[PDB]
Amino acid sequence: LDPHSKCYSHINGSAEELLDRLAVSELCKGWPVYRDASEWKNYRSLFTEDATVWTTWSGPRPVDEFITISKAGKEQGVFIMHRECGTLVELSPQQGRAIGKMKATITQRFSFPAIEFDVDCDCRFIFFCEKDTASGAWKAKYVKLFYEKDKVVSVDGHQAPKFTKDELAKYPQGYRYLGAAQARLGYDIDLQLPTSSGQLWDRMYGEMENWLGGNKVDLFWEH
Amino acid sequence: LDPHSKCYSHINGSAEELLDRLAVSELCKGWPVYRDASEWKNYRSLFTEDATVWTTWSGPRPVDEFITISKAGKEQGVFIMHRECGTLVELSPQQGRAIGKMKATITQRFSFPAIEFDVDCDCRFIFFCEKDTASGAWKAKYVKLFYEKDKVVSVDGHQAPKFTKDELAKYPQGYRYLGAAQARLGYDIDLQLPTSSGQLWDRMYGEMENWLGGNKVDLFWEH
Amino acid sequence: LDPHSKCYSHINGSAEELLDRLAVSELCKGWPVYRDASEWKNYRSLFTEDATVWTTWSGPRPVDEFITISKAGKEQGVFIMHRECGTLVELSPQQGRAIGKMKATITQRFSFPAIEFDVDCDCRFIFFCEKDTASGAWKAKYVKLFYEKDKVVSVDGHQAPKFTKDELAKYPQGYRYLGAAQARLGYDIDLQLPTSSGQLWDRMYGEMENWLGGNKVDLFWEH
Numbered sequence A, B, C: 001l002d003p004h005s006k007c008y009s010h011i012n013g014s015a016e017e018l019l020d021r022l023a024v025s026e027l028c029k030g031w032p033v034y035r036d037a038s039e040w041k042n043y044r045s046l047f048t049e050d051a052t053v054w055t056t057w058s059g060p061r062p063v064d065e066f067i068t069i070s071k072a073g074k075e076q077g078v079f080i081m082h083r084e085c086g087t088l089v090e091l092s093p094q095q096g097r098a099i100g101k102m103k104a105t106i107t108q109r110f111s112f113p114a115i116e117f118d119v120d121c122d123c124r125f126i127f128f129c130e131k132d133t134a135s136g137a138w139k140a141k142y143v144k145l146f147y148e149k150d151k152v153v154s155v156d157g158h159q160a161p162k163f164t165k166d167e168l169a170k171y172p173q174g175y176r177y178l179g180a181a182q183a184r185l186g187y188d189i190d191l192q193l194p195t196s197s198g199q200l201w202d203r204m205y206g207e208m209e210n211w212l213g214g215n216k217v218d219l220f221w222e223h
């Protein structure tokens, strides 16, 4: 079933609309390109001053705190990379609002006592972006993902870790292996993130349309 | 050997040509972004009223029929996703014609009696696009793929299905695992789709250049 | 730690800057799209007349020589494909210089006496691009990669080759499986390419900033 209630500017349009969607698509791609390379000045430039992000391993975080704990994770050997997999934009020109839709694979490299493995999670980043009236610059205020499917990837093609059914069961279908593997590192995993189906799926689309309509949104789903 | 007989607008150029290639590249990315999310209003907006698409599992279909059977497949648990892998455009400004070249991986999740597995097929979508003279809007009239290579992907890193040599043999090299796995679902697989080499490879490039030259094309290869 | 000493034009900006970054991002994507399809006229159009490229299997090569040996490799059955994984640009408008940052997976299909396998190497292509003052056209003068991680991929989901520890040990971490598998084909592998960490990582960022500052660069790291 079509999750969108209406249509927004997403293809063709004026040169101004094309260039707005291009600018927003660049912001989205900044997450994989700059985070994976620890280009923190570039990464911070993507966001509003009051921005919040959500991940499986951090839950919601103000962006500056997210950068702090990301640096700490990287210093402790955490190795998360991204593959961007298709980016388009929904633009609301009169509201100065846009949604960036960026398909991706989160590909995180782990060790098991040594057995190397990736967990690859196909997902869709949703960037809630706004245009500064004065400068015309787009910035992201919120980033939250849909989680679609995941898998365990052997690095040598022979050996892979083992997860019990009970170890995987507490996580939503879509990020069970990613959640379980990150939990083994000691992280407290957010279990209230949207997947391909269900309650939080409709909720995410509701908040996306609220944003594009100009409202405040409610992406804080534990209170 | 270089399959192109000549060169078209593909890099640099005027701002108008850059923005035309950008608009066409967005159309291409609409297939992965909108089909994977069942955003059917957005997906239908990519196409002309008389558009036709080709897939391994459907053969040629008018786009509205393709949407109907895609919805039916999804209701029956079919789980096809796409990873877009690099998109560029060949533009013929005087003909109001363009070809979108979108590298992708078709990644389809299957079950085997239960063993979960993906088949990942590296391919290249070819979007035959035309510009409305009145509105200036680009739309896709035809979509057909080159199929380059495929593989079976274990989801848990340990278990994978088994395909006999005879089960794989009827399919062209490039989509043998994808065809064989989709056939197990009951689909009648199109065996006349182009791959990295051979008769239909040259034919596809011939039709691409015919389109860019302004002709009608013949992508219907069974009559 | 943030490897960049300063910031360049990378998001938002004027329409002219947006369109310059778009044009450079297209050049980058030409490598996967045109090389994988043997579209050699298109591929050669990406480069300056005096361009040089670096790969694991060729070392540094003037681009026309690289095309010659790539054609020879393909005739001998070499099967390298690319998946583009996120592309952004650093622009220095006053210098007429840009750096294209293109995340990618090199995915090379091999045989072992027969066992089919891929090696997939996550990497970042760095395109050193310059703008022709007369025409305004962007072209790439240098292409060199960061190599981040790699893995062996079973094609049938059951069988995979075996590499000894000693066979992998001479290569930098980031492309050990890719180097080892290409060496089995008879290629002499360049061992002085940058990875996620260390001496050549800082050197690459130094040369990137030198380029953006307008200098000649020194990417020739064996003399």
Ligand SMILES: O=[N+]([O-])c1ccc(O)c(O)c1
Residues within 6 Å of the ligand: A035, A054, A055, A056, A057, A080, A106, A145, A178
């Ligand atoms: O940027 N990352 O590191 C991310 C972003 C979202 C996630 O859910 C995640 O597990 C990692």
Ligand SMILES: O=[N+]([O-])c1ccc(O)c(O)c1
Residues within 6 Å of the ligand: B035, B054, B055, B056, B057, B080, B106, B145, B178
């Ligand atoms: O969009 N899909 O579902 C597609 C498109 C082309 C294919 O050949 C296919 O097997 C699936």
Ligand SMILES: O=[N+]([O-])c1ccc(O)c(O)c1
Residues within 6 Å of the ligand: C035, C054, C055, C056, C057, C080, C106, C145, C178
């Ligand atoms: O284009 N290719 O064939 C490439 C480019 C860089 C590499 O390091 C490589 O092994 C292959």
Ligand SMILES: [Ca+2]
Residues within 6 Å of the ligand: A016, A019, A020, A023, A136
């Ligand atoms: Ca604008």
Ligand SMILES: [Ca+2]
Residues within 6 Å of the ligand: A218, A219, A220, A221, A222, A223
């Ligand atoms: Ca709330």
Ligand SMILES: [Ca+2]
Residues within 6 Å of the ligand: B016, B019, B020, B023, B136
């Ligand atoms: Ca136009």
Ligand SMILES: [Ca+2]
Residues within 6 Å of the ligand: B218, B219, B220, B221, B222, B223
């Ligand atoms: Ca015909």
Ligand SMILES: [Ca+2]
Residues within 6 Å of the ligand: C016, C019, C020, C023, C136
């Ligand atoms: Ca320009």
Ligand SMILES: [Ca+2]
Residues within 6 Å of the ligand: C218, C219, C220, C221, C222, C223
């Ligand atoms: Ca030197």
Ligand SMILES: [K+]
Residues within 6 Å of the ligand: A084, A085, A086, B084, B085, B086, C084, C085, C086
């Ligand atoms: K991509």
